[PDB]
Amino acid sequence: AAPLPELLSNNGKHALMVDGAPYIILGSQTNNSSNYPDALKDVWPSMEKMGANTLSIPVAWEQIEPVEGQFDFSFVDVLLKEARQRKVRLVLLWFATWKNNAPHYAPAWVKLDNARFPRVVKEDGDTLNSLSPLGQNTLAADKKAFVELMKYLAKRDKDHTVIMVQVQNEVGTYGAVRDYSPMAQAVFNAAVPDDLIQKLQLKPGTWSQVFGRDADEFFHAYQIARYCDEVTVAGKAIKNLPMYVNVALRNPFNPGLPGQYSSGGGTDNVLHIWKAAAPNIDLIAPDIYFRDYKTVSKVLELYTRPDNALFVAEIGNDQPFARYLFPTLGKGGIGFSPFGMDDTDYTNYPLGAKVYNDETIEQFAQVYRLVNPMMREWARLSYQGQVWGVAEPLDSTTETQKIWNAEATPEEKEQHKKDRASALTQQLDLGLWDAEVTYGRPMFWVTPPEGNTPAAGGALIAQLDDNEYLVTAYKARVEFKPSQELAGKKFMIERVEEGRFEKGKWVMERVWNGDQTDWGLNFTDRPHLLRVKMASYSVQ
Ligand SMILES: CCCCCCCCN[C@@H]1C=C(CO)[C@H](O)[C@H](O)[C@H]1O
Ligand code: NA
Ligand code: NA
Ligand code: NA
Ligand code: NA
């Protein structure tokens, strides 16, 4: 009976609707070789420990169509049944024409037949192991198999255990900007399509005439976007699930050249091409492995747009990455999915954690525990209302940084401490009230913040009414104050309640008061959900 999942976009805000209401993916993604029945026993325990509500896991073209026309959905059958037993949802990752630029997950009868299914050809005439998006047989074959997967879900997944499908994995090309095959050159050395000229409001011409120095890259992005949109449309005609693409990000400050980064993917410079070329693709999701706050923050800014719901489709599984949940949700993100959350004997350090163990999982579990108890209420407030979210904005002190700290004078030291306390103090404008969020200080008195070791804190705030906020935070202090001068009036906290939602209704457990509200609202590693009511009052 259940309504299809759907991505809603209204008033520049977004919701992923699941079972007729907004939903947050508190996700985990498997390692790349866990897409088989025998591997699932090494996936579920981690998902339970993490408290994730949705599993991202590959479905590979090589596994469903190992011999052309001979489909095998045995893996999908087991996965659906085992996910349902655990009352979790699924995001299937279609690994097909591209997985990290390459056709490794395409069947042997595809990836070993270059004449039928041709590769990118560099300007110098050398071939790269990246399938050309101008290969018409490759598009037809990928589309046919994707359709068979969507028919399987149409017939066998009536309650939508699968809520979303990723189409390909990190498309593009390493080692060239585009295809320079004779086939590609005939399409490049030709008019830009009318649709793209109309949607970007440009003057007609050839790719080189219209886009100049960007022609090669924008050509590759356009042709890959068109390919992915055709696969998406074909699959949606069977079952209209949300579908998205995930991006091998370029560094947003210092990207280098296309082909150094994965050329033609949804990088920040070609989001306009992708949105014009692929209007059937619901969102373009960043895959985040930059560890440093400023770069991560910049990625979250670039990918959150009126035309783009924010979904952190991948993030590293090392400790520093967990706190990015908070800004992701504060931007109205629909989900967050740390990569490599299984015990299949693999670690992707230097991208992720050096060691996979219960402590690795616990860093994410601890932040998920703040959101799970309010997931549906948060998702509704994010979409229909005003939310905020912050993370601790200094990264952990370096080996290098401690050396520079050790060699500093006592004036340079006390100055560094004032500077760190300032950087670890964030202001949020909540309308009539502001919050100040600080990191790494006692739960009593006003010693300045010194940060957590390692960096780890954050906060979420949702506005319930002009003077009332839902607040939860982690290894941080949150303090409220008036946003504007009060002309003679004083202010206080009126009431802080800790509680929970039962059947969508607020249940109070206790009132925070006294020491618990005199020095801000102090959070450790334990979950507390608060409703904070502020008041200004006359003394005249
Ligand atoms: C900050 C430097 C990051 C360089 C990484 C760029 C490519 C990331 N690709 C993703 C990351 C992993 C995690 O191991 C897997 O290969 C995923 O399948 C891939 O989508
Ligand atoms: Na949202
Ligand atoms: Na204000
Ligand atoms: Na203000
Ligand atoms: Na509680």
TrEMBL record:
Its EC number is 3.2.1.23. Pfam families: DUF5597 (PF18120), Glyco_hydro_42 (PF02449). The keyword Cell membrane does not apply. Keywords: Glycosidase, Hydrolase, Signal. Residues 42-192 form the Glycoside hydrolase family 42 N-terminal domain. GO terms for molecular function: beta-galactosidase activity. One of its GO terms (cellular component) is beta-galactosidase complex. GO terms for biological process: carbohydrate metabolic process. It comes from the Bacteria. Residues 364-523 form the DUF5597 domain. The keyword Signal applies. This is Beta-galactosidase, putative, bgl35A. It comes from Cellvibrio japonicus (strain Ueda107). The gene is bgl35A.
